[PDB]
Amino acid sequence: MSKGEELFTGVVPILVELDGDVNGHKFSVSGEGEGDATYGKLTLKFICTTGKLPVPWPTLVTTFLQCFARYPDHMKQHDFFKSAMPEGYVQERTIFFKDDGNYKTRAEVKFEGDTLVNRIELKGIDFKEDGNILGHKLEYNYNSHNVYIMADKQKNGIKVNFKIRHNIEDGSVQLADHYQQNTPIGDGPVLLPDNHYLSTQSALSKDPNEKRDHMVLLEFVTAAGIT
Ligand SMILES: [Ca+2]
Ligand SMILES: [Ca+2]
């Protein structure tokens, strides 16, 4: 019921490009993989191209593709993300790390030909030198979360909020509160959803032959909350 829905019935190649500055530490990440929205499935490999990543890889997972969520057929009228394609959407976030600094991000997600592209600028400030982020105290793992979606009708987009729980090496938890807004790039109509959420599961791993600083990500994203 959108033109965009049909762009995602098969396997779609994905590119991710991020430039970051966290407390003056500048870095870039390039990612490649593919997405199969029929199964809510994402498989991606990220590589830090400027050397060693200066923050923990788990802190960047949410920044590095919600147009690949599997929306059940009865919920397809609530898929804002695909409806903005191919022209795309801007995805903006503030991520507040409890007792620590914050990330501000701006992403443009759209098709470049047949390839779905996520281009990101990230700015992190007020981080603690011996905090869990700059001190690299977060485990290389990931929890499952619900991301809550609301229409923003006076902006023709959506508002999204959720809390990520990052495991800390001492057994504790680093909360990362996400405030998110998405707005279409083009001028065409989009689908404005009723309230609902995306259930997310993610698995981080390493490529045994890769010597560069990297992250392999397997994700499943499923819309829910409307019956
Ligand atoms: Ca450590
Ligand atoms: Ca309605």
Beta strands 12-22 and 25-36 are antiparallel
CB of 20 closer than 8 Å to CB of 104: no
As a whole number of angstroms, the distance between CA 71 and CA 27 comes to 34
Give one word for 49, left, alpha or beta, with left for phi > 0 and alpha for psi -120 to 50.
alpha
Q: What is the CA radius of gyration of the chain?
A: 17
Total domains present in the chain: 1
As a whole number of angstroms, the distance between CA 176 and CA 95 comes to 6
Give residue 206 CA to ligand 2 midpoint distance, Å: 43
For 16, residues 6+ apart whose C-beta sits below 8 A from its C-beta are: 29, 30, 31, 32, 44, 46, 64, 65, 117, 118, 119, 120
Give residue 78 CA to ligand 2 midpoint distance, Å: 9
**Cα–Cα distance list, 66 to 88, 91, 110, 189, 199 (Å):** 12, 10, 12, 18, 11
CA 116 to chain centre: 13
As a whole number of angstroms, the distance between CA 124 and CA 22 comes to 4
Give one word for 41, left, alpha or beta, with left for phi > 0 and alpha for psi -120 to 50.
beta
Method: X-ray
The residue type at 189: P
Side-chain-side CA neighbours of residue 93 (13 Å): 27
As a whole number of angstroms, the distance between CA 51 and CA 212 comes to 7
Ligand lying closest to the C-alpha of residue 78: 2
Ligand lying closest to the C-alpha of residue 140: 1
Domain range enclosing 187: 1-227
Select from 4, 3, 40, 91 the least CA-distant residue to 223: 40
Task: Give the tokens for residue 73.
Answer: 């057929």
Give residue 191 CA to ligand 1 midpoint distance, Å: 43
CB of 184 closer than 8 Å to CB of 84: yes
- Dmax over CA atoms of the chain, in Å, equals 50
Ligand lying closest to the C-alpha of residue 168: 1
- Rounded to the nearest 5 degrees, what angle is found at the Cα of 92, between the Cα atoms of 114 and 142? 80
| DSSP bridge partners of 164 | 176
b (16+ CB within 10 A) / e for 124-144: beebeeebbbbeebbeeebee
CB count within 10 Å of CB 11 equals 14
Task: Give the tokens for residue 3.
Answer: 């033109």
Give residue 146 CA to ligand 1 midpoint distance, Å: 27
CB count within 10 Å of CB 217 equals 22
As a whole number of angstroms, the distance between CA 118 and CA 111 comes to 9
Side-chain-side CA neighbours of residue 209 (13 Å): 0
DSSP labels, the chain = --TGGGGGSS-EEEEEEEEEEETTEEEEEEEEEEEEGGGTEEEEEEEETTSS-SS-GGGGTTT--GGG-B--GGGGGG-HHHHTTTT-EEEEEEEEETTS-EEEEEEEEEEETTEEEEEEEEEEES--TTSTTTTT-B-S----EEEEEEEEGGGTEEEEEEEEEEEBTTS-EEEEEEEEEEEESSSS--PPPPSEEEEEEEEEE--TT--SSEEEEEEEEEEES--
Residue owning tokens 């890769």: 210
CATH number for the domain including 134?
2.40.155.10
| DSSP bridge partners of 176 | 97, 164
Residues less than 5 Å from ion ligand 2, measured at CB: 194
CB of 53 closer than 8 Å to CB of 31: no
Give residue 187 CA to ligand 2 midpoint distance, Å: 22
As a whole number of angstroms, the distance between CA 193 and CA 152 comes to 9
Ligand lying closest to the C-alpha of residue 136: 1
Give residue 94 CA to ligand 2 midpoint distance, Å: 28
Give residue 132 CA to ligand 1 midpoint distance, Å: 9
